[PDB]
Paper text:
AMPA glutamate receptors (AMPARs), the primary mediators of excitatory neurotransmission in the brain, are either GluA2 subunit-containing and thus Ca2+-impermeable, or GluA2-lacking and Ca2+-permeable. AMPA glutamate receptors (AMPARs) mediate rapid signalling throughout the brain, and orchestrate various forms of synaptic plasticity that underlie learning. These cation channels assemble in various combinations from four core subunits, GluA1–4, with each contributing unique gating kinetics, trafficking and subsynaptic localization. AMPARs exhibit a modular architecture with a two-layer extracellular region connected to the transmembrane ion channel (transmembrane domain, TMD). The ion channel is encircled by diverse auxiliary subunits, modulating receptor gating kinetics, pharmacology and ion flux, with the transmembrane AMPAR regulatory proteins (TARPs γ2, γ3, γ4, γ5, γ7, γ8) being the most abundant.
The Phe231 to alanine mutation, which destabilizes this interface, slowed desensitization recovery of GluA2(F231A), both in the absence and presence of TARPs (γ2 and γ3). NTD and LBD changes contributed additively: the R/G-unedited (Arg743) isoform harbouring a mutated B/D NTD interface (Phe231Ala) recovered the slowest. A desensitized GluA2(F231A) structure unedited at the R/G site (Arg743) exhibited more separation of the LBD dimers and an approximately 10% increase of non-swapped receptors relative to the edited Gly743 isoform, approaching GluA1. This suggests that the re-assembly of desensitized A/D LBDs is attenuated by Arg743 through charge repulsion, resulting in a greater proportion of A/B LBD dimers, and thus non-swapped receptors. Closer analysis of the three sets of desensitized structures reveals a gradual transition of the LBD tier into four-fold symmetry, which is greatest for GluA1 and smallest for the edited GluA2 mutant: GluA1 > GluA2(F231A)-Arg743 > GluA2(F231A)-Gly743. Hence, communication between the NTD tier and electrostatics at the R/G site in the LBD orchestrates AMPAR desensitization recovery.
Residue numbers in the entry:
A (entry chain D): 520 to 551, 569 to 626, 633 to 635, 637 to 709, 711 to 717, 719 to 764
B (entry chain A): 716 to 719, 721 to 774, 784 to 823
C (entry chain E): 5 to 42, 55 to 84, 92 to 162, 173 to 210
D (entry chain A): 569 to 629, 632 to 666
E (entry chain A): 422 to 506, 510 to 519
F (entry chain B): 765 to 774, 784 to 813
G (entry chain C): 569 to 617
């Protein structure tokens, strides 16, 4: 609940408060206050743990020291408990390329595999250099195979696939799409070069797009 | 600068294209060049060059900054206590009959 | 056991002064990851100079640029001029000077109390300096051995102050006999 | 050992920080004052800690969308006077 | 200078042509006036043959594709919202 | 004309209002203590 | 009094319920035991709440 620096400065403040309480309590010969250095340390520790006092300073200055230590203790312990209540109540990308504990691959034959085999972008070229030489193979014969490998690898396998398929996030049981898309592209209805169907099907796709059919079908 | 923000998701998805007059002779070579520049990563380098390379705007635990004020008060109180003690000691040491 | 107490307090004062001076002069306070003299590489930043390492031109380094709501201006000013670490160094120096002068002009047994007060005040200034340093750094990382030399100087200074006050108490106890 | 003005102030301060007492009232009137101050302290410190926990818990979990812009009118909004953005809106069949 | 200046030089090299950059006179992207039915902006320059090519952040839209040709996208994007926009205090424990 | 020409409409910190009761109890207790002391 | 077995059980129970002390250890060893018990109590009660 508290940063390492807060703990370290709590210990320094404990030593300082104990020493200043010892100094002020017993330095003037006119006081000769059972606060020796050992008893000052005990008083400060027991004040911090909100525990019994058994001795309280009687002088004005020892009382100033005691009062500010009490305030400090109240604020610090309240904030430790509050932040613990907050704690109890309630791979990201490049990340894959910079590490090796988590394996990652693509469909063994796909536009994804070709994207990496040809990328001139450093991160993707590094990922391709790794994937093409990784053993065992990180490539899969079917998307379902990649999904199962992710599901059975306990987080040690990430799968690169098209955002659209990454649908699987809405399927029972344990997977998640992380980061943004690595590229931007589109699916198209394909016909043999020079096909008679090319023009009517291109116009139909635009008609189905404009009438909202493609959005209804994805939903 | 002055770095004073894009909010929400995009309202739609589309693209910018190189445009030519309907039936232009340049249409095929320029379509292929855009795809060559896409595949060779030129388009990513140029967006990075002009958006981010020259960009002028670029934990759960509790940090010491959240509580530094209580430390300042503590040390100030220790100092005040030492001053009060020394003032009283000087007063008593000067109050002996001479 | 008087006599060895005086040697222990003198050694402690000298050790605290040397440690705090080395901490202020040296620059391995924070192992951050930033730019060396004007690529992001590690750096052994310090109280004055953010100095470079593991870089294209490692070893070439500059003076930190402290400055780019009066509270932020005041904190940035107090952290730019290391007034609190430097005040800790001065107070440790004066404490040592009082302890040394406790042999000459003896029988006063009232300057050794001033030595204790100087050492305690040096510790308090040191802790304020650490707090302002860490607070201003919040404007991955780690802390170097200069930071811990400052912290160890604080601890030794507090112990030497406790010894000095104990010796002053013992001296007035002997005098009251 | 008895409640003079300075000791009264020390007792009250220590009772507020929940830091125990080196001495407590012994009379009926002193005990009424002590008990009521103890109650006040318990409620105020419980409430300080509870509200700090609320602050941190909520912090751990003015336009955010086009829906937001559409539902209000204090903030004006527009597009390039001639552009594909203006045409997107002039032809949108989406309600928002 | 700019992204499209850099892109124009590269499109011209890979297509093998010399070119002359001209800023669209009316400073518009291109819309068909509902009324005069005239195309303005960069689209108009291409439709009426004042320019041979447009290399700009010109969005591929259906109404434009009906009157001019577009390459595949060189940039993907979407409409978005631009709005005008912490160190804890020292005595923040009193909050 | 009929809607707008004749329009007639043209985790916060804790406040002293939700702990006021404990202040009232405190001052009432101080008054009662003073009364009991004076009676005795 | 000093810490016999009954008084030591009472001291520990009073420490856990955060209900202050009537006695506290005075020697270095007693104080180490008391200190670690106080820390343990603080963490466990804070975590319960
Ligand atoms: C009887 C018992 C004795 C008790 C003794 C009480 C003693 C009270 C001492 C309090 C010290 C205040 C320091 C200060 O003002 O902090 C400044 C930081 O600037 C610094 O970095 C502070 C420098 C170190 C302070 C050394 C003591 C900022 O403070 P501010 O500007 O005032 O804060 C308002 C704005 N703010 C909240 C956003 C920050
Ligand atoms: C006989 C008893 C001896 C005396 C015992 C003393 C111990 C009590 C001290 C408490 C902290 C006091 C300081 C409270 C902090 C004040 C800071 C403040 O007011 O901050 C202003 C802020 O910026 C918005 O205006
Ligand atoms: C005068 C008599 C003195 C009495 C003495 C009573 C002791 C009270 C404190 C006990 C806890 C101290 C131990 C804290 C250990 C911290 C654990 C640690 O070091 O953290 C591990 C690592 O840093 C992260 O992974
Ligand atoms: C042995 C001598 C000890 C002397 C005694 C010391 C005082 C006791 C402490 C607190 C009293 C609290 C009083 C609580 C008052 C409650 C008010 C109330 O209940 O009103 C709410 C209302 O019912 C909703 O509609
Ligand atoms: C009142 C003085 C002592 C109170 C107990 C404080 C415990 C001190 C712990 C210091 C080291 C903490 C290390 C935590 C940081 C980390 O986990 O990396
Ligand atoms: C505010 C509270 C009142 C402040 C003190 C006022 C001065 C009255 C004289 C008291 C003299 C000290 C006597 C004592 O220690 O009991």
């Amino acid at each position: 609940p508290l940063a390492y620096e807060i703990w370290m400065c709590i210990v320094f403040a404990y030593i300082g408060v104990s020493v200043v309480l010892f100094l002020v309590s017993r330095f003037s010969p006119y006081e000769w206050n059972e606060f020796g250095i050992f008893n000052s340390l005990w008083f400060s520790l027991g004040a911090f743990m909100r525990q019994g006092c058994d001795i309280s300073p009687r002088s004005l200055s020892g009382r100033i020291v005691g009062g500010v230590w009490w305030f400090f203790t109240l604020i610090i312990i309240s904030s430790y408990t509050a932040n613990l209540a907050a704690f109890l109540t309630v791979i990201e990308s490049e990340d894959l390329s910079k590490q090796t504990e988590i394996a990652y691959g693509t469909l063994d034959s796909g536009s994804t595999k070709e994207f990496f085999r040809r990328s001139k972008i450093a991160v993707f070229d590094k990922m391709w250099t790794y994937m093409r030489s990784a053993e065992p193979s990180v490539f899969v014969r079917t998307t379902a195979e990649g999904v199962a490998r992710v599901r059975k690898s306990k987080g040690k396998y990430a799968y690169l696939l098209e955002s659209t398929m990454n649908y699987i996030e809405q399927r029972k049981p344990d997977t998640m799409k992380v980061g943004g898309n690595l590229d931007s592209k589109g699916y198209g209805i394909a016909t043999p070069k020079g096909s008679s169907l090319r023009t009517p099907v291109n116009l139909a796709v635009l008609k189905l797009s404009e009438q909202g059919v493609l959005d209804k079908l994805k939903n | 600068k002055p770095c004073d923000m894009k909010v929400g998701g995009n309202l739609d998805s589309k693209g910018y294209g190189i445009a030519t007059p309907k039936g232009s002779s340049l249409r095929t070579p320029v379509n292929l060049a855009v795809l060559k520049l896409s595949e060779q990563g030129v388009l990513d380098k140029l967006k990075n060059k002009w958006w981010y390379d020259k960009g002028e705007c670029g934990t759960s635990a509790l940090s010491l900054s959240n509580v530094a004020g209580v430390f300042y008060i503590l040390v100030g109180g220790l100092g005040l206590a030492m001053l009060v003690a020394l003032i009283e000691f000087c007063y008593k040491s000067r109050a002996e009959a001479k | 056991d008087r006599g060895v107490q005086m040697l222990l307090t003198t050694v402690g004062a000298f050790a605290a002064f040397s440690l705090m001076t080395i901490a202020v002069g040296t620059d391995y306070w924070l192992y951050s990851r930033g730019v060396c003299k004007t690529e992001e590489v590690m750096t052994h930043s310090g109280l004055w100079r953010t100095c470079c390492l593991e870089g294209n031109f490692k070893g070439l380094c500059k003076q930190i640029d402290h400055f780019p709501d009066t509270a932020e201006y005041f904190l940035r000013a107090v952290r730019a001029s290391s007034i609190f670490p430097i005040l800790s160094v001065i107070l440790l120096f004066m404490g040592g000077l009082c302890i040394a002068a406790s042999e000459f002009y003896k029988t006063r047994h009232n300057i050794i109390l001033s030595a204790g007060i100087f050492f305690v005040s040096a510790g308090l200034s040191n802790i304020i300096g650490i707090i302002v340093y860490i607070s201003a750094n919040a404007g991955s990382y780690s802390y170097g051995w200069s930071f811990y030399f400052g912290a160890l100087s604080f601890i030794i200074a507090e112990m030497v102050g406790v010894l000095a006050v104990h010796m002053f108490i013992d001296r007035h106890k002997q005098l009251t006999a | 050992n008895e409640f003079g003005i300075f000791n009264s102030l020390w007792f009250s301060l220590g009772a507020f920080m929940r830091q125990g007492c080196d001495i407590s009232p012994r009379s009926l009137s002193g005990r009424i004052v002590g008990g009521v101050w103890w109650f006040f302290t318990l409620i105020i410190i419980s409430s300080y800690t509870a509200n700090l926990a609320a602050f941190l818990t909520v912090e751990r979990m003015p336009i955010e969308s086009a829906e937001d812009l559409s539902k209000q009118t204090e903030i004006a909004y527009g597009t390039l006077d001639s552009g594909s953005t203006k045409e997107f809106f002039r032809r949108s069949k989406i309600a928002v | 200078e700019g992204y499209c200046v850099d892109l124009a030089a590269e499109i011209a090299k890979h297509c093998g042509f010399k070119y002359k950059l001209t800023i669209v006179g009316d400073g518009k992207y291109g819309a068909r006036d509902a009324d005069t039915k005239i195309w303005n902006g960069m689209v108009g320059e291409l439709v009426y043959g004042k320019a041979d090519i447009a290399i700009a952040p010109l969005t591929i839209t259906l109404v434009r594709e009906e009157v001019i040709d577009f390459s595949k996208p060189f940039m993907s994007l979407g409409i978005s919202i631009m709005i005008k926009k912490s160190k804890p205090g020292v005595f923040s424990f009193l909050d």
